[PDB]
Amino acid sequence: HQNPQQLSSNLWAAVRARGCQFLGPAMQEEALKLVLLALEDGSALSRKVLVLFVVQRLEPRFPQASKTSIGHVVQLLYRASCFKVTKRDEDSSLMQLKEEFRTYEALRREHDSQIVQIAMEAGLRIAPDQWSSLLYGDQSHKSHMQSIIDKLQ
RNA sequence: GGAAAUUAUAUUAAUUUCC
Ligand SMILES: [Cl-]
Ligand SMILES: [Cl-]
Ligand SMILES: [Mg+2]
Ligand code: NA
Ligand code: NA
């Protein structure tokens, strides 16, 4: 039905329609490792403070980094149920990384699984080779992406 | 039809805007 270019443009439109973002393989990897740096020890941050922590540190290598773009990455993890959220009446909620997502491998798998879930919600059928290219810019994460698809079905 | 920024406690709702 759709060629690869069409599947890709429709995938990123569906991601952006949920207030989520993928910043590209290198920038997304660094954004997620900064989320881990802030939260792996169980610190409880508001969205404001997590976004500040990650943006200003990305900015030198990735001048495109904004509150908006990094907020959209944090929203992808939020939609993925990666955070334990503490509500505070008439105040900002605090967020902690659930214990099972306090390594890069586990957090990155949950992140990837959520983008595949968005593809499934949007009716976009994308093969593991295209997923590896989209999320990693290489063909060395095909088996990883295949595993994620099969665990979602 | 697509994109960016900005706001918010968002499994999200809007605003503004340079195609
Ligand atoms: Cl498939
Ligand atoms: Cl935007
Ligand atoms: Mg505005
Ligand atoms: Na939104
Ligand atoms: Na969450």
Mark residues 87-126 of chain A whose C-beta is closer than 7 A to nucleic acid strand B.
Answer: 87, 90-93
Q: How was this structure determined?
A: X-ray
Which nucleotide has the shortest C1'-to-CA distance from A92?
A: B9
Mark out the alpha helices in A40-95 (DSSP H runs).
47-58, 67-79
How big, in percent rounded to 5, are the helix, strand and coil portions of chain A? 60, 10, 30
Cited resolution, angstroms: 1.6
Residue A40 CA, distance from chain mean position: 16
Extents of the domains making up chain A: 1-153
Q: Which residue's alpha carbon is at the shortest distance from the C1' of B5?
A: A68
Return the structure tokens found at A15: 């991601």
Q: A18, A144, A39: which is closest to A99 by C-alpha? A: A39
Distance A104 CA to B10 C1' (A): 25
Task: Report which residue type is found at A54.
Answer: V
Name the residue with tokens 């509500």: A87
Q: Classify domain A1-153 by CATH architecture.
A: Up-down Bundle (1.20)
